[PDB]
Assembly symmetry: C4
């Protein structure tokens, strides 16, 4: 029964733990094509979880992209996702996974419309199911769920419309629903939750696909007492987004429609993340805000990890081990396009971890 360590490690920079090489114009045939990938770790190692939809042998024979028969797979971090290296878990359209210290809890959502429902698996057996309450498709955040002392927490979205979506925090134990809390999210939309835990608190960053280019933030406790916070920055981090504005706790309404999964490290000094410019989905920059993200958006540190690389989803994951540090590490994963492979068929899932040491502002392009 894993607990996050006593304190957050001081973060002064981010270094990549996983970053591969170009898989070239032509691919081998046994690679699995994926989307909505994320990272989750057990006590020894970390894993890629992804929604598989095709084989690389059909690189040029498949629609881009395909909303057909999709299935959740897992692959050891460090290994390429192939038919010989990857393991099927469940059929699914979106998913979440987490390790409690004993077993893996895996959630998948299947179906669109009212027939949509969620399956929960706990170490090799399906343990629980529940159906949609609000008509629309049930949606999992495609990110690590969070486990504390045998209790796992995950946010499920429901509702057919972005202008009337509902969102719930579910508490699970052994793959069984114990209880949930429906959130008052009126006025906003909270999709693609990516979360992390610190000192028995869970902090999640959301994505507003409706009316905001700023990212809504969620903080809650084991008793599901919650608070939703809006960044008091003037710098939107969603994509798409508008330009800089005067700092205020007002939502960023310009180009609020749309969005992509992304993260905000809501701590004592805060870390923000976004594409380099709002005109294009290229590059990735991390910026430190000492007074927190509920302050004015005053940047002390700015790292440009990528300049030209086409960038996509990003989210948190926490390594559950660290036999060397007495502090709780924080890491994030990030989709980067292998431009040597046409049509965005290959989004590498890169990973970065925070370090207590400052680092060069190196470009990883």
């Amino acid at each position: 029964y894993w607990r996050a360590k006593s304190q957050m490690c001081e973060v002064k920079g981010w270094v990549p733990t996983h970053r591969g090489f170009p898989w070239g114009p032509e691919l081998p045939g046994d690679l699995i094509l994926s989307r909505r990938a994320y990272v989750s770790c057990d006590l020894t190692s970390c894993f890629k979880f992804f929604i598989a939809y095709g084989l690389s042998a059909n690189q040029h024979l498949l629609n881009t992209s395909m909303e057909w028969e999709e299935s959740l797979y897992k692959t050891p971090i460090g290994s390429a996702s192939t038919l010989s290296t990857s393991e099927m878990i469940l059929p699914g359209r979106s998913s979440s996974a987490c390790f409690d210290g004993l077993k893996w809890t895996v959630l998948v959502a299947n179906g669109r419309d009212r027939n949509s429902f969620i399956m929960i698996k706990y170490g090799e057996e399906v343990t629980d199911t529940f159906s949609a309450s609000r008509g629309g498709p049930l949606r999992l955040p495609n990110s690590e769920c969070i486990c504390i002392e045998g209790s796992c927490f995950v946010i499920v979205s429901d509702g057919p419309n972005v202008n009337q979506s509902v969102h719930r925090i579910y508490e699970l134990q052994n793959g069984t629903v114990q209880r949930w809390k429906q959130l008052n999210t009126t006025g906003i939309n909270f999709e693609y939750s990516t979360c992390y835990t610190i000192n028995n608190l869970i902090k999640c960053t959301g994505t507003n696909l409706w009316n905001d280019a700023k990212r809504p933030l969620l903080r809650f406790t084991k008793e599901l007492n919650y608070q939703i916070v809006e960044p008091c920055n003037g710098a939107p981090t969603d994509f798409p987004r508008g330009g800089l504005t005067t700092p205020s706790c007002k939502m960023a309404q310009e180009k609020g429609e749309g969005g992509i999964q992304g993260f905000i490290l809501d701590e004592k000094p805060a870390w923000t993340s976004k594409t380099k410019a709002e005109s294009s989905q290229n590059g990735f920059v991390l910026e430190q805000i000492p007074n927190g993200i509920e302050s004015e958006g005053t940047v002390s540190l700015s790292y440009e990890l990528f300049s030209n690389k086409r960038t996509g989803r990003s989210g948190f994951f926490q390594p559950k081990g660290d036999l060397i540090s007495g502090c709780q590490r924080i890491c994030f994963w990030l989709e980067i396009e292998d431009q040597t492979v046409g049509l965005g068929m290959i989004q590498e899932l890169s990973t970065f971890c925070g370090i207590n040491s400052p680092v060069q502002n190196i470009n990883w392009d």
Copy 2:
């Protein structure tokens, strides 16, 4: 030495535990082409057992189908069957496998006509063999055999014609025949047995390729006391089959010739399974019958798991693990054709398990 749990779990729905993604028009070269696949589990995991006949590199260069040199292979469930993931067991045309709690018992049948015989393997070494007694080829049901308290049970078929076939129960211990019992099957044919065990009883659903579109049923004990039963329904579940009829315990003679391996769960409420319509081998529907299958056929629940998918063989398997449930779960596997792969070269072996919860009538096409 595995023992079955006290009672069957209450089943209100079926959820897929295995369901993959389209393998596209073109396949990679190292995939193994298979037939007669089924599922069997040990204490930790489940495995696909199949008769291998070719490689995917020769997808368009092979006779279809090839009843040449065929060989029994095994693959961890969740992994694709490739030359690097699949493992040779024995040469064979049909097979059965079961795990007793200590070692695997594997049976294979080889040869046609009078030279036909069966090899029995028990944990890495071949321990016993026996020959055809009735001239024709020895035939195994291509499904999990049943092990109880160190004793494993399997049904063996013999005879060159379906209109005078013979069927026997063999009892094994440490891969050696302890004794056998020939069943009185006059008037019927009982091929492709798929079985499960509960409270010292083994129940098998058979397939009549001769004169019945209903599925004959078998119940027996460790002492080889048996009873053969005909469904008193009016709704045939075999393929091919005729239309709905007036309920009776009489066989359905309309389109009785031919058949496909299939299952009937005869418990306190019973579960029946079949293609959606008799006109085509498409779809798959599960129907619940509260009064048992020897009653009149009154349906309470009807789940249409597939509508358009081309459907094939189905049969039982029981997971021998389940650390969350104290009752005996039941699962089935089902061949579903990957329509993106031409000529039915790919039958995915999907799996469904029963749950105590009611679930949506979702289409898994």
Copy 3:
């Protein structure tokens, strides 16, 4: 420290433990091309050892023959030999391997002419070497060596001509030469030795590439005391060979030139093995000779395991486990050509094991 059991199992039949399926006209690219393969087992599992010379991707681009940079590899029996499944051991032109109960002893011979020498590897490390003493290339038998109580035995051949070859028994312990004894093989030639042990005795079948169509026999003890025996049969088993003649302890001179690796199970009763007819290298027949091989060759049992399949090298291996038998099992491996693959690039290494029961004369084509 593994020891062979007290007694030989009574053998009345042979059953295939390994026999695969056609790999078709076209192969996937990652298969390793091999020759001089054989089988050897540890306490748990068995392995294929082979001399690798190429990749299947160059199936149609490689010369016959290419006697070039060759390397000894190993692959778990039950797996195809591929780049992801096979493991390099040592560079080598011929080899021998045996497991002592703790570690593997592996021998390879490299070089032609006088620069030829042998490397001995004992669990990941090279432990001893010795060079050619008699001018010609050093040759290992390409079959399992034999270990008894930590002492391992292998026959090494030397000399550039078959009419003046020399042969020595080397006794090794911990991968180091303890002693060797040169055999008086004057008048004959003793290549391609395949051996098995029973009751502290080692029995080997040789191949005469010079002047005999019969297979010479060797029997020796841990103390390197030996006896060389000629079959008193009238039925030669080498290939090529002449027709049947009157039984005598005389060599079979017709077509004595040339030969192929093969085995004779010399016990009481003895088993002989050979091609179906002397005109062609198709098929394989096992014949039982009750009074031993030093008698006249009166056959009681005759099995035609293959009829049309092209047959090649064959030799012994002993499974070192068997927790079901108190007797020593005996098995043989056999090259069978996959005729679906052109130019004999694929020699499937099938394996047969002896059983205490008589079995049907089934054709395994």
Copy 4:
């Protein structure tokens, strides 16, 4: 906490432990293209560490060479480097790795110019980083670092010019820098360090890319007492290089510019190694010098391992196991070009180990 044993084994010859077969004109698609490979072993086995830049599927579609996004990978020695067999460690341009008895210490350098820095990883987690001190890029030697009693040592090079490079010994513990020592290397250049240890002495051979065709030598202790030595030979071993000269301890300045990673075994008899001739990068010859390398270059033994084979980088590795010798074995790795594969896309990483027995002067072409 592994320590190398008391004294070096007497070395009279070198035998290949790894030497493969031609991978032919055409390669399969899933092979990883590599550069800067070296070998390092744990308690059980040895591993290939390399810088990956591409896939073999793009054999004819890739530039030679590719200075793009490079990543450090590892593969079990004996296995081919494939997407299914190789594992990503860290992104990197050059690297070093060593095993302390518990965990792997891995260092990689990224960036050119002033942004260059090094990451240190200790068992699955990043533990330390440090940046350039001298403007130019940080460089690791692309060879095994050295661990003694929990202390690991590696040479880090810096400076944008060969005519004023700096080199430091770093001491690491648990993936953490304890201290570092800058060497006085004024007048020379010390790149591509390959090192080995004996009884608390570390001996490294360097490569001078600036003004020397002899290889600079380094000797140091756990407490960083060090000495830089020049061979008093008359035979330069670097490539490129000029011809033989009169023995002296002065640098060989003819063709001193440039160089290639190479090794010198400085022991009580010394061993030198180099290409066959200075005219071309073909062949490899090992020469023994009884009075040590600070003596006159008097050769007693000369082995020509290769004549025609194109040869590249070479360096040391030590097996940390070996239960047959009570003495410390020494091994080296050697890049050899697979000439059946065009454009030197395949550099096989061959390995040789020293032995106390004399061996034939056999050519491994």
